[model samples]
Target chain A: DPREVILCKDQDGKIGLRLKSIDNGIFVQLVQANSPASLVGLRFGDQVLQINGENCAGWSSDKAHKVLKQAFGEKITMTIRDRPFERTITMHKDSTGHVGFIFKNGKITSIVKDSSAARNGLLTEHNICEINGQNVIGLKDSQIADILSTSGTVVTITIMPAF
Target chain B: DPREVILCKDQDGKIGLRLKSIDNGIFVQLVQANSPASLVGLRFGDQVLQINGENCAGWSSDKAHKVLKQAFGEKITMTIRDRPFERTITMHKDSTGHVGFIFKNGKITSIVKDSSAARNGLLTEHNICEINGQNVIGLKDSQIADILSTSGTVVTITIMPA
Candidate 1:
């Protein structure tokens, strides 16, 4: 039998983690979306580097998870080196609650029909922008919502059409 | 602009072509759960192989989709090699139907919640079996009813207590 699944810490405050295959630029599966990770626009295929101002080199998934748990609901500072350039981001942890979003091809694709996402105007093939005033281009759905659910009402979502 | 999305044929049936990453042990993410490619038995991570006996190796995602479009709703043999092991499976593509389970952790997880599960007991941790005939181990609350709404009546649930 599988272990009892605990509703662990909200992924809203977690860090988004994925392994970028050196062989192909494509990112493999998402390892974890600990709090605040996905909220900042982190997606599965996004190639990431630093978490909250710390380098991810030599870091195992467990270690990375600890970083997210400790930083839950706290301000998160990160430096992401996506292939062409490096970008720095700062995010605050969510206190309200979070919702789940499915990503595909660099944009928000689907929202669970009855989830917090459904309540929000998250539609299939919609590009996401801000949830409760947070930037989500680089964050994952769980992480972004964690902060937004706690920070304010009216989960503000921004979206664009998929080409 | 992105390439015009197209439906393609597989040995199993028609499927949407999308981009995926090889690094994550995944090719394309399953966006919808309607067709043979998106049904519940196959979750987000299962690898796609031969559709109706057509091999997927070396085939670009677009090419594979082309093959899938031809077999929608028809009984097309499939080979799904996933986390647990590789196997040749048979799937039926039906225009009026959907799958009962969603694939995750290399096996089928129920997408529907069972009435029996709701009536008899709450699924505590470590009890990974059906309550009556419902698969409650990893099922979300909504899935129990959701599966029933579309799949059929007469739900069954079983449970495994730790």
Candidate 2:
């Protein structure tokens, strides 16, 4: 049972974490940033094993949330177990999707010659802001690639040139 | 938008956080328990907004995972947005399911005196472990009821009597 603890102020002054109850325990669903839990280090996928010295191993997320809220004070201590970490990326591509450019660290690191990126005047090292209206600011190269490749033909990319 | 951050020691001693990219943004799919991300309080449904100070708002989960793994390190920071929450409970019933007891907190709080629960020697306060093989430990009362009611006529319940 890997255990972790988080401490912070509830920035929103409300419940700082969203929870999901699974068979093994009440798992962390979402932790608001700068919220009490986030300030101390709460992430998605943490399981609540215990709260306030009480064994919450089999409690539902609702029960656990209620308990935590009921007993909350200036600070809270939660015993949690971590779940395996992974990221999921979803993209849609129709027959008209465009193959645009290679991206990294939110920048158009490379534009496919004569491709959409090039045709649209996108340049190397150009800062990407959005893809099809979705922001790409801290996104990875692979993510950028997915958006570009699966965005269909005539893909719209918003960017800023590096000075 | 609301933002969240998670840190976790990857299973291989790297960063831990599974991401899924959707049309809107990169979403949190999983987070290893006791990993750096868990320690910091990461949870599911949180959308990736940024990573290591870079904007990752519109990335796919696959791309995010690969990139994060490729840049594996001792500590990592991620910014995320919380999604609206709801739970979906699915249960099925054939001719073998039964309605015999009212459950609470994974326990048979009450029984329909002549119902299958009593007929099967299940007593009040019995700890319910599973309903037709599915663990009901952390399930809600309604969810438990759904399982019991939809379990057909001869419902099988694993329990420990109080």
Candidate 3:
């Protein structure tokens, strides 16, 4: 999947881009100025859906950077989602009443390092839209967390990358 | 605090470091191999405390990068903390139990986008050790949430950058 990826360079560096892996997944955290990334139209808030045809949604920081480092020449292609794109994930809360992450204002902002979210390879905290098929577009931020707090074991959510 | 930070370069770019800003602050999220960052000691989990002697803990992503971009020369100096250090902040909860963020295993992993925590410039979620001066080293993850959930109006927390 040669999806939405871009380019970068300059000042004696390799690719003019930075990749970040949170409890969620891998994302484009930085796109240097005047570099290949900027030239290729790569900006912030973009998620690396794939790297060199490999699924990067669950790629580790070490793994991603290693690939980027070795790809010093021309062998770099990424599948990325620019912004406001929708993605989905399903998780299970354990005995501790923990769902592996937290949500507020319909957006999942923080996450546990070893929780289901981390295990599921989420890039980081993401903006949420639906939980278990229920649309939270009109819900309050406070109520959303509570809906989670009082939910059943299974939690399936629809997410949009938060801007 | 020109404290701590690092470097990078290659393939076709500049400095090899990924900077991420959450409700907490800015941080190094990636360090490409064999780049300046990897050679200069910049690694993932390093907190960008300052840039050219300017505090970046409260700087936005746009501002941080603008500065990083304009600093396209031998003028990039970053103050960073290579992590797990302690810091503190006090916040108030109003009619809601948001507390602005969430914690697990002594670390914060989630946050409320616009609460006191966000206003205070949290990087994302951080590891915490104390609540109103109470040592949580001996407590459980589930218990910590309840402690804050049932607490009074003012909540003072001592955190370690996670």
Q: Can you list each candidate's DockQ?
A: 0.01, 0.02, 0.01
Worst 10 residues of 3 chain A by lDDT: A1-10
Looking at candidate 2, what is the lDDT of residue B139?
72
Which order, best to worst by lDDT?
3, 2, 1
Of the candidates shown, which would achieve the greatest lDDT relative to the real structure?
3
Each model's interface RMSD (Å)? 21.1, 16.8, 17.5
TM-score of chain A of each: 0.31, 0.49, 0.46
Q: In order, what is each prediction's RMSD in angstroms?
A: 19.7, 19.5, 25.0
Q: Which stretch of 10 consecutive residues in model 3 chain B shows the poorest summed lDDT?
A: B1-10
- Least accurate 10 contiguous residues by lDDT in model 2 chain A: A84-93
Task: Work out the TM-score per prediction.
Answer: 0.23, 0.30, 0.27
Tens-digit per-residue lDDT, B98-155, candidate 1: 3233334323332223222212222222122333343343466566546445444343
Top candidate, metric TM-score: 2
Q: Could you give candidate 2's per-residue lDDT for residues B1-162 as a string of tens digits?
A: 445464645556665567765433466666665667656756555556667765554455667777787664555666655432212212233344545456677766654533443323233445565677665654788888887776665556665422
**Native-referenced DockQ of model 3:** 0.01
Selected candidate, larger DockQ, 1 vs 2: 2
Candidates arranged by TM-score, highest first? 2, 3, 1
lDDT of 1 by residue, A1-163 (tens): 1011112234354344444322111221353444344445444324334555454443455565666567455455544432211111122223434454566644655444334443222334444545544556566666754555566434455453332
Residue runs of model 2 more than 4 Å from their true location after superposition: A11-15, A85-163, B1-162
Highest DockQ model number: 2
Comparing candidate 1 with candidate 3, which one achieves the higher TM-score?
3
